[PDB]
Design a binder for this molecule. Structure first.
Ligand SMILES: CNC(=N)NCCC[C@H](N)C(=O)O
Length: 304
């Protein structure tokens, strides 16, 4: 088993670098955020442009869906997050509190909470209904590159340019684990596995690692791509074969066999750094997006 991802659609419309793409949990939509200050919505299967959602005053670094596919949250250089009703286009809340660029965000599975990370070195936990900041965690000593909830929402993982991945108890705000690996290269991305047993972390030394975060043991290392500057998203692909998917600074999408760590496909087509990739929740579909010199989003499909 190798996959056979092939380009199906190219989605053009952002006028500056794309920052993040994400599929809706219900599989119907792709949301994209950009340095152009906009969120765009596209059909997940046909790439058909759906709408633009606007309101942020500066570029957006991340976007994320609620569990029911009705809301988005966005993280902006304007130091706010916004909560959006996707269908109406309304900004429901503006989450204020961070003192610098907000870089990363996610809903918990219940989607009553949002987690954010910022250049202000903090992680903040927010109440979705009221927009109030519930906790400010003194999480890191450099910008926070990623934040993610585990499968039951009881944990948060954060990554930072300080070289650390930390695991937090959602309820208490307590730091439960600090993951340490040698020379402490900036951690540019992190997320939990779908099952919540592992985390996948990217570091700016051209490396992805799969950690057992409780035991604190690096289980797999994925290499061959280029990642020394940008906070590039990585993924677990679980709809067919078990893959690791990542963007890369050589303009390619990389796909590794999770177990063997071998590169199984490289997807060519983008003309600038592939900053973001996402994997469709039920079909073997990858979305990718690129930086300023490209500005397009691509939808690729495989038989496995
Ligand atoms: C968690 N978000 C993220 N990795 N976004 C992509 C990078 C956005 C950044 N503002 C940049 O242009 O490099």
């Amino acid at each position: 088993v190798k996959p056979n991802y092939a380009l199906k659609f190219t989605l053009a419309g952002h006028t500056k670098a794309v920052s993040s793409v994400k599929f809706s949990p219900n599989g119907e939509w792709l949301a994209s955020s950009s340095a152009d200050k906009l969120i765009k919505i596209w059909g997940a299967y046909d790439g058909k442009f759906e709408k633009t959602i606007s309101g942020h005053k500066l570029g957006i670094s991340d976007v994320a869906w609620s569990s029911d596919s009705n809301l988005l949250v966005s993280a902006s250089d304007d130091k706010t997050l916004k909560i959006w009703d996707v269908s109406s286009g309304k900004c429901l809340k503006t989450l204020k509190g961070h003192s610098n660029y907000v870089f990363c965000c996610n809903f918990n599975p219940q989607s009553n909470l949002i987690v954010s990370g910022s250049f202000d070195e903090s992680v903040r936990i927010w109440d979705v209904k009221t927009g109030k900041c519930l906790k400010t965690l003194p999480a890191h000593s450099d910008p926070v590159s990623a934040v993610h909830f585990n499968r039951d929402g009881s944990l948060i993982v954060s990554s930072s340019y300080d070289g650390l991945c930390r695991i937090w108890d959602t309820a208490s705000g307590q730091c439960l684990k600090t993951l340490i690996d040698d020379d402490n290269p900036p951690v540019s991305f992190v997320k939990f596995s779908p099952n919540g047993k592992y985390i996948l972390a990217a570091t700016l030394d051209n490396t992805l690692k799969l950690w057992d975060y409780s035991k604190g043991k690096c289980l797999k290392t994925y290499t061959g791509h280029k990642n020394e500057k940008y906070c590039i998203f990585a993924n677990f692909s679980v709809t067919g074969g078990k893959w690791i998917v990542s963007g890369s600074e050589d303009n390619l999408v990389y796909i590794w066999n999770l177990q063997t760590k071998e590169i199984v496909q490289k997807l060519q087509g983008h003309t600038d750094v592939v900053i973001s990739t996402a994997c469709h929740p039920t079909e073997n579909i990858i979305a990718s997006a690129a930086l300023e010199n490209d500005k397009t989003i691509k939808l690729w499909k495989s038989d496995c």
